[PDB]
Design a protein around this ligand. Structure first.
Ligand code: HEC
Length: 104
């Protein structure tokens, strides 16, 4: 994937709702401390819907690569929406970047 690439794709589109290199808190949006890690519903104490809260999927490509296209697509029972990096190539950059971004 890419680091500086998805580093700009992330801080440009999911930066106000997904924190990874800034801290990983539930700021205006949920951080990515659950990305590529087997666990999806990180700390449900945030506001996940009735699925990501204590979900059971993962966040590699097909899991993210799918989500990224359209949030509700992976789980329309979610409570977030944003169709920005739905293209594809850049999408991958987003994942890889994050993989080591929130690995701080
Ligand atoms: C707020 C306006 C959001 C933006 C912008 C993006 N996401 Fe989102 N995402 C949001 C919420 C609130 C949730 C959790 C469900 C809920 O109802 O609270 C999510 C979920 C994800 C997930 C899965 C959750 C997990 O445990 O990992 C992923 C993988 C995810 N979001 C990715 C993602 C990306 C790549 C975004 C930018 C292209 C993005 N989200 C925007 C809130 C918001």
């Amino acid at each position: 994937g890419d680091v500086e690439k998805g580093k700009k794709i992330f801080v440009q589109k999911c930066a106000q709702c997904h924190t990874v290199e800034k801290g990983g808190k539930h700021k205006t949006g949920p951080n990515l401390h659950g990305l590529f890690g087997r666990k999806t519903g990180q700390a449900p104490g945030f506001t996940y819907t009735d699925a990501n809260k204590n979900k059971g999927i993962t966040w590699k490509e097909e899991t993210l690569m799918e989500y990224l296209e359209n949030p509700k697509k992976y789980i329309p029972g979610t409570k977030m929406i944003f169709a920005g990096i739905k293209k594809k190539t850049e999408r991958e950059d987003l994942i890889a970047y994050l993989k080591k971004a929130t690995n701080e």
